[PDB]
Design an enzyme around this catalytic site. Sequence first.
Site, PDB file in Angstrom:
ATOM      1  N   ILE A  27       0.805  -1.218   0.000  1.00 56.26           N
ATOM      2  CA  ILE A  27       0.000   0.000   0.000  1.00 56.26           C
ATOM      3  C   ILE A  27       0.839   1.269   0.000  1.00 56.26           C
ATOM      4  O   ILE A  27       0.292   2.356  -0.251  1.00 56.26           O
ATOM      5  CB  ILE A  27      -0.971   0.030   1.200  1.00 56.26           C
ATOM      6  CG1 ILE A  27      -0.209  -0.177   2.510  1.00 56.26           C
ATOM      7  CG2 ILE A  27      -2.060  -1.017   1.031  1.00 56.26           C
ATOM      8  CD1 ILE A  27      -1.077  -0.073   3.744  1.00 56.26           C
ATOM      9  N   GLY A  28       2.138   1.177   0.270  1.00 58.37           N
ATOM     10  CA  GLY A  28       2.957   2.371   0.320  1.00 58.37           C
ATOM     11  C   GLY A  28       4.452   2.136   0.297  1.00 58.37           C
ATOM     12  O   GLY A  28       4.939   1.086   0.727  1.00 58.37           O
ATOM     13  N   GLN A  29       5.186   3.119  -0.217  1.00 59.44           N
ATOM     14  CA  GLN A  29       6.646   3.138  -0.186  1.00 59.44           C
ATOM     15  C   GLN A  29       7.120   4.542   0.177  1.00 59.44           C
ATOM     16  O   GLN A  29       8.003   5.115  -0.462  1.00 59.44           O
ATOM     17  CB  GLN A  29       7.231   2.685  -1.523  1.00 59.44           C
ATOM     18  CG  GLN A  29       8.181   1.496  -1.431  1.00 59.44           C
ATOM     19  CD  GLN A  29       9.540   1.858  -0.858  1.00 59.44           C
ATOM     20  OE1 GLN A  29       9.860   3.032  -0.677  1.00 59.44           O
ATOM     21  NE2 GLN A  29      10.350   0.844  -0.575  1.00 59.44           N
ATOM     22  N   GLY A  31       9.079   5.859   2.068  1.00 62.81           N
ATOM     23  CA  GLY A  31      10.423   6.107   2.553  1.00 62.81           C
ATOM     24  C   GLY A  31      10.797   5.212   3.715  1.00 62.81           C
ATOM     25  O   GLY A  31       9.922   4.763   4.462  1.00 62.81           O
ATOM     26  N   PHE A  32      12.092   4.943   3.875  1.00 64.49           N
ATOM     27  CA  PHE A  32      12.609   4.060   4.919  1.00 64.49           C
ATOM     28  C   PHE A  32      11.998   2.662   4.851  1.00 64.49           C
ATOM     29  O   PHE A  32      11.961   1.947   5.858  1.00 64.49           O
ATOM     30  CB  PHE A  32      12.398   4.661   6.316  1.00 64.49           C
ATOM     31  CG  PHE A  32      12.766   6.115   6.413  1.00 64.49           C
ATOM     32  CD1 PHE A  32      14.093   6.507   6.446  1.00 64.49           C
ATOM     33  CD2 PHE A  32      11.782   7.089   6.472  1.00 64.49           C
ATOM     34  CE1 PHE A  32      14.434   7.845   6.532  1.00 64.49           C
ATOM     35  CE2 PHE A  32      12.117   8.429   6.558  1.00 64.49           C
ATOM     36  CZ  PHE A  32      13.445   8.806   6.588  1.00 64.49           C
ATOM     37  N   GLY A  33      11.516   2.258   3.680  1.00 65.91           N
ATOM     38  CA  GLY A  33      10.938   0.949   3.473  1.00 65.91           C
ATOM     39  C   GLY A  33       9.566   1.033   2.843  1.00 65.91           C
ATOM     40  O   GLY A  33       9.043   2.107   2.551  1.00 65.91           O
ATOM     41  N   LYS A  48       5.211  -2.608   7.851  1.00 67.90           N
ATOM     42  CA  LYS A  48       6.201  -1.663   7.345  1.00 67.90           C
ATOM     43  C   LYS A  48       7.566  -2.339   7.375  1.00 67.90           C
ATOM     44  O   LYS A  48       8.133  -2.554   8.452  1.00 67.90           O
ATOM     45  CB  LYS A  48       6.194  -0.379   8.175  1.00 67.90           C
ATOM     46  CG  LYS A  48       6.608   0.865   7.409  1.00 67.90           C
ATOM     47  CD  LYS A  48       6.088   2.118   8.095  1.00 67.90           C
ATOM     48  CE  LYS A  48       4.573   2.068   8.243  1.00 67.90           C
ATOM     49  NZ  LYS A  48       4.034   3.251   8.969  1.00 67.90           N
ATOM     50  N   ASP A 140      10.049  13.708  12.215  1.00 65.83           N
ATOM     51  CA  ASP A 140       9.442  13.779  10.890  1.00 65.83           C
ATOM     52  C   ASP A 140       7.951  14.086  11.027  1.00 65.83           C
ATOM     53  O   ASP A 140       7.086  13.373  10.523  1.00 65.83           O
ATOM     54  CB  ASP A 140       9.684  12.486  10.115  1.00 65.83           C
ATOM     55  CG  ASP A 140       9.450  12.646   8.621  1.00 65.83           C
ATOM     56  OD1 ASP A 140       9.538  13.786   8.118  1.00 65.83           O
ATOM     57  OD2 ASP A 140       9.172  11.630   7.949  1.00 65.83           O
TER      58      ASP A 140
HETATM   59  N1  LIG Z   1      -0.972   2.778  10.504  1.00 60.00           N
HETATM   60  C1  LIG Z   1      -1.490   3.116   9.315  1.00 60.00           C
HETATM   61  N2  LIG Z   1      -2.802   2.968   9.110  1.00 60.00           N
HETATM   62  C2  LIG Z   1      -3.320   3.303   7.931  1.00 60.00           C
HETATM   63  N3  LIG Z   1      -2.696   3.789   6.872  1.00 60.00           N
HETATM   64  C3  LIG Z   1      -1.389   3.933   7.093  1.00 60.00           C
HETATM   65  C4  LIG Z   1      -0.709   3.627   8.262  1.00 60.00           C
HETATM   66  N4  LIG Z   1       0.627   3.901   8.130  1.00 60.00           N
HETATM   67  C5  LIG Z   1       0.748   4.355   6.915  1.00 60.00           C
HETATM   68  N5  LIG Z   1      -0.441   4.404   6.236  1.00 60.00           N
HETATM   69  C6  LIG Z   1      -0.697   4.843   4.867  1.00 60.00           C
HETATM   70  O1  LIG Z   1       0.292   4.310   4.045  1.00 60.00           O
HETATM   71  C7  LIG Z   1       0.997   5.326   3.332  1.00 60.00           C
HETATM   72  C8  LIG Z   1       2.481   5.016   3.303  1.00 60.00           C
HETATM   73  O2  LIG Z   1       3.247   6.070   3.842  1.00 60.00           O
HETATM   74  P1  LIG Z   1       3.926   5.986   5.352  1.00 60.00           P
HETATM   75  O3  LIG Z   1       4.481   4.595   5.588  1.00 60.00           O
HETATM   76  O4  LIG Z   1       2.905   6.546   6.289  1.00 60.00           O
HETATM   77  O5  LIG Z   1       5.145   7.008   5.096  1.00 60.00           O
HETATM   78  P2  LIG Z   1       4.984   8.620   4.582  1.00 60.00           P
HETATM   79  O6  LIG Z   1       3.906   9.216   5.452  1.00 60.00           O
HETATM   80  O7  LIG Z   1       4.768   8.488   3.102  1.00 60.00           O
HETATM   81  N6  LIG Z   1       6.505   9.215   4.926  1.00 60.00           N
HETATM   82  P3  LIG Z   1       7.791   8.421   5.898  1.00 60.00           P
HETATM   83  O8  LIG Z   1       7.283   8.461   7.339  1.00 60.00           O
HETATM   84  O9  LIG Z   1       8.977   9.348   5.622  1.00 60.00           O
HETATM   85  O10 LIG Z   1       7.960   7.006   5.339  1.00 60.00           O
HETATM   86  C9  LIG Z   1       0.629   6.648   4.018  1.00 60.00           C
HETATM   87  O11 LIG Z   1       0.651   7.746   3.169  1.00 60.00           O
HETATM   88  C10 LIG Z   1      -0.708   6.380   4.701  1.00 60.00           C
HETATM   89  O12 LIG Z   1      -1.746   6.794   3.859  1.00 60.00           O
END
Ligand SMILES: Nc1ncnc2c1ncn2[C@@H]1O[C@H](COP(=O)(O)OP(=O)(O)NP(=O)(O)O)[C@@H](O)[C@H]1O
EC number: 2.7.11.1
Length: 288
Positions: A27-29, A31-33, A48, A140
């Site tokens: 669902i996301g990248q 940063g830091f993984g 994560k 951050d």
């Molecule tokens: N605990 C969580 N619950 C729901 N959505 C989440 C959660 N953590 C992250 N996300 C979503 O997943 C995406 C991935 O980004 P995230 O891992 O949050 O890093 P970032 O906010 O993009 N910056 P960084 O903290 O530098 O990695 C985010 O933009 C959120 O929308």
Amino acid sequence: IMVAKSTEFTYQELAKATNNFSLDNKIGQGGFGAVYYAELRGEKTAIKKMDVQASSEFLCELKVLTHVHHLNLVRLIGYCVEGSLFLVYEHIDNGNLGQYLHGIGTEPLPWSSRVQIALDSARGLEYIHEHTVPVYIHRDVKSANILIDKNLRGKVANFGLTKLIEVGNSRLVGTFGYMPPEYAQYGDVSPKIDVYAFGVVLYELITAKNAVLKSVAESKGLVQLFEEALHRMDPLEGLRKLVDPRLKENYPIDSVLKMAQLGRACTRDNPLLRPSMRSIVVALMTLS
Ligand SMILES: Nc1ncnc2c1ncn2[C@@H]1O[C@H](COP(=O)(O)OP(=O)(O)NP(=O)(O)O)[C@@H](O)[C@H]1O
């Protein structure tokens, strides 16, 4: 019910819930993984992945992430150390504050909800800065790290990931527009980093504009935009030009002024002149 706080997952258990870490569950990248959605033991989670050597100092920093307990922090449900580092957080169905303010698809956040979310976020950072000694820093703070639930309440996300990355591998750390001058240019680390970044979040709640304003190739910060709005002949009219157009005129001008004045104090060049997170909480409570 459950009395334990965190659970140590296994690698086989995480791989099964994410289809062996397939790209569909990713669902996301940010940063830091990378981040993966997962359903672990009757809960919606977010895995994560962080690539860190499992040193004892790394585990000591991991204890800080598993021991913190506050309603305004995203809960770290569990962790996994076999192979690389996996961090399992609770899933907040609604997105982050940046998607609400700077995005379309969700109804506009009422001003009272923005005061509530700012207060919710401030209490989460205040807990981080004052819960233990030495003082720990989020490092951050940004709108994307503030998650909103269905009840429109704030939770600070991704606390301590900066320290884990630095101690495991001992822009580097931080997000453009959220870094104070003494850290962006000289790396000076102090809790005033989070206070400065929080002031930008207050600026975003007022304006729904990004920290870095979108001639070209030359960036302009939202902090400078409030400097030009409030340091003029009519500071109220300069502020009214900055308020989120989605809010229309449904906001108390004095309450928005007080939040803008609070962001000014947080964004001062000298970090010693910035208020603590405790003062910000008590100041935000007079607006709610
Ligand atoms: N605990 C969580 N619950 C729901 N959505 C989440 C959660 N953590 C992250 N996300 C979503 O997943 C995406 C991935 O980004 P995230 O891992 O949050 O890093 P970032 O906010 O993009 N910056 P960084 O903290 O530098 O990695 C985010 O933009 C959120 O929308």
